[PDB]
Amino acid sequence: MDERDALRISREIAGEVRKAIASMPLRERVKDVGMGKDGTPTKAADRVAEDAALEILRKERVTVVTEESGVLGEGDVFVALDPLDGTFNATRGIPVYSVSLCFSYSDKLKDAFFGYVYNLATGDEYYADSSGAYRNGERIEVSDAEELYCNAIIYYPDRKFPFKRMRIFGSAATELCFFADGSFDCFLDIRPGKMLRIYDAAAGVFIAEKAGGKVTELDGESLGNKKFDMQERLNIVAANEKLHPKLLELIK
Amino acid sequence: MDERDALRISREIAGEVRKAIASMPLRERVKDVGMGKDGTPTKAADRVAEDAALEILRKERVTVVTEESGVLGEGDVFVALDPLDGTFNATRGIPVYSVSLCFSYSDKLKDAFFGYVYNLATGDEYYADSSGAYRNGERIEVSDAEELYCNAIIYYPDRKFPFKRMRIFGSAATELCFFADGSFDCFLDIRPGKMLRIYDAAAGVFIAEKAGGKVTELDGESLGNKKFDMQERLNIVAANEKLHPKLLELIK
Ligand SMILES: N[C@@H](CCC(=O)O)C(=O)O
Ligand SMILES: N[C@@H](CCC(=O)O)C(=O)O
Ligand SMILES: N[C@@H](CCC(=O)O)C(=O)O
Ligand SMILES: N[C@@H](CCC(=O)O)C(=O)O
Ligand SMILES: [Mg+2]
Ligand SMILES: [Mg+2]
Ligand SMILES: [Mg+2]
Ligand SMILES: [Mg+2]
């Protein structure tokens, strides 16, 4: 498989998932219908989304790490799937929620070769390969803000900060992308628990990196070794090169 | 005038504005074109929105209190207008932003008789008259959450809280209606400055009360006396009847 197949697969799925959620009225979407292998409830929207997604994926030589169904397949290419990121929003008609894939040549992020995030409410399409970062076909890159007084997406602010704006949209895959097209200046998830899971971040981090951003663990460490398993967890500090270190301090 | 008129006017404006913004490309929307009588920059997006709206309201027997142009007219009915709430989002193509009208029979919120908030990205229409609260024509009400571990929209978190979720979407008018229809459990702007301005909250507060919400100031105090002027600034604590008082202490 190559980063063009990925684009094709990814787009095919975005079609099917988008179609799946569009039909389902809100009262249907919001129904807990399962326990997800993740250990959080599978809403009905999660189920129809992942079923559609998985159906296209099962045909490829891949191991899929997805939120509702766990780890599936045995192929050498690993795919980290959040078949609906921002499920909460989606069950309430709030239009920030996405399907998110990240393809890796191994079970570690450092061997990623494609990131895809598709806003299922708007149709905005984010992805990245060796050629760079795109939004709706158009090359993108991060902001150059240098002052802590910037536009921050942050999970969760636990004290007085210096930022110009703070926002939290409830779709990390999409919010990594908002950072990656310079809509926002940084992206932090500093929640002490380490809540983010491989399928939540993987595509966003990749796409953001390709768009110039510097994206690290809390302590400043690289994300390269983060694993594609159900068990992996993440904190993120993402910001262009100048801003990042200052944030790294502010967090201390 | 009458609520039915208010409804007709409000709709006319949502049409003209929704249209003005949709034609205007992002790179145009995001340009600072003035200082607003409110004391923040007017963007091109704020201006084409406000102009569109004001073209319609000029023909009515009203005093308008808007964000970019200040206080205009002599008429006995006051109209708190945010001609575009969530400007930041609108300039980045993030789908939460809207136009927000609130009509009152005096310069005081207690004398309000219509609230309107129309999501300009999605076309969701929120409003409320003597009859009650509506989203897209259908009656709405708040949630019955009784537990602090709830879905909170909150500007801004300054410490560890106990909520199930926190979100900040950057359109107070729309976020108030998210609470109004039960999508979130509560709305808090506890920002020490008291940052909010009349045309940001008025429609949202109204629409929330008519949908069941208890909506007070930081200290439980009533909002009825909040004036329709540019000086007026607000904190909000909104939550259903049971939940509300629990929150009022939580923030001491
Ligand atoms: N495959 C989706 C959209 C994805 C895309 O065009 O990138 C569709 O045709 O509806
Ligand atoms: N009432 C909300 C609580 C949050 C949750 O269960 O996810 C819901 O059904 O979603
Ligand atoms: N002119 C507005 C009002 C809403 C309605 O007529 O239903 C619109 O349709 O976008
Ligand atoms: N052009 C502005 C957008 C809004 C603002 O921050 O005032 C910026 O650099 O952020
Ligand atoms: Mg999911
Ligand atoms: Mg998720
Ligand atoms: Mg405005
Ligand atoms: Mg505004």
Swiss-Prot record, chains A, B:
Cofactor note: Magnesium. Can also use manganese.
Gene that encodes it: suhB
Function as written in the Swiss-Prot or TrEMBL entry: Phosphatase with broad specificity; it can dephosphorylate fructose 1,6-bisphosphate, both D and L isomers of inositol-1-phosphate (I-1-P), 2'-AMP, pNPP, inositol-2-phosphate, beta-glycerol phosphate, and alpha-D-glucose-1-phosphate. Cannot hydrolyze glucose-6-phosphate and fructose-6-phosphate. May be involved in the biosynthesis of a unique osmolyte, di-myo-inositol 1,1-phosphate.
Keyword Hydrolase: yes
Keyword Ribonucleoprotein included in the entry's annotation: no
Residues noted as binding Mg(2+) 1 in the record, renumbered to the chain: 67, 82, 84
GO biological process, one term: phosphatidylinositol phosphate biosynthetic process
Residues the entry annotates as binding Mg(2+) 3: 38, 40, 67
InterPro entries the UniProt entry points to: Inositol_monophosphatase-like, Inositol_monophosphatase_CS
GO molecular function: fructose 1,6-bisphosphate 1-phosphatase activity; inositol monophosphate 1-phosphatase activity; metal ion binding
Protein name: Fructose-1,6-bisphosphatase/inositol-1-monophosphatase
Reaction equation(s) it catalyzes: beta-D-fructose 1,6-bisphosphate + H2O = beta-D-fructose 6-phosphate + phosphate; a myo-inositol phosphate + H2O = myo-inositol + phosphate
Cross-referenced Pfam families: Inositol_P (PF00459)
Positions contributing to Mg(2+) 2 binding: 82, 85, 200
Similarity comment: Belongs to the inositol monophosphatase superfamily. FBPase class 4 family.
Regulation of catalytic or functional activity: Both FBPase and IMPase activities are inhibited by Ca(2+). In contrast to mammalian I-1-P phosphatases, is only very weakly inhibited by Li(+) (with an IC(50) of about 290 mM).
Residues reported in the UniProt entry to bind substrate: 85-87, 167, 172, 191
Cofactor: Mg(2+); Mn(2+)
EC code: 3.1.3.11, 3.1.3.25
